[PDB]
Amino acid sequence: ATRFASVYAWNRKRISNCVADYSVLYNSASFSTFKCYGVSPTKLNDLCF
Amino acid sequence: LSRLDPPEAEVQIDRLITGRLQSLQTYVTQQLIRAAEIRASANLAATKM
Numbered sequence: 001a002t003r004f005a006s007v008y009a010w011n012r013k014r015i016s017n018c019v020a021d022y023s024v025l026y027n028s029a030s031f032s033t034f035k036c037y038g039v040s041p042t043k044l045n046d047l048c049f
Numbered sequence: 050l051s052r053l054d055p056p057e058a059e060v061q062i063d064r065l066i067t068g069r070l071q072s073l074q075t076y077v078t079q080q081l082i083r084a085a086e087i088r089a090s091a092n093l094a095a096t097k098m
Contacts, residue, residue, distance in 0.1 A: 040054045047052065 020045050 023043035026034055034041050050058050
């Protein structure tokens with residue numbers, strides 16, 4: 001998506017009915033920054049949230 | 050150990066181990082003191098017998 005929300009009035013969305021893919025986002029590495037807390041950034045996609 | 054990067058896990062684990070060990074040490078010490086009181090009672094019973 002080319003349009004991320006305005007920060008002035010940003011809106012949180014909720015995620016359900018997903019196959020976790022943290023390791024997919026991470027491995028494709030399209031984002032330059034991947035810094036995780038509580039979850040290893042080193043592809044930890046073993047967990048179920 | 051399955052959620053955090055190894056060194057992050059080491060910090061969180063050290064916090065948890067210390068907590069668990071201090072709870073056990075408190076427990077063991079209290080039983081050791083109560084056990085001593087029980088020994089004293091047992092010695093009295095043996096005398097009465």
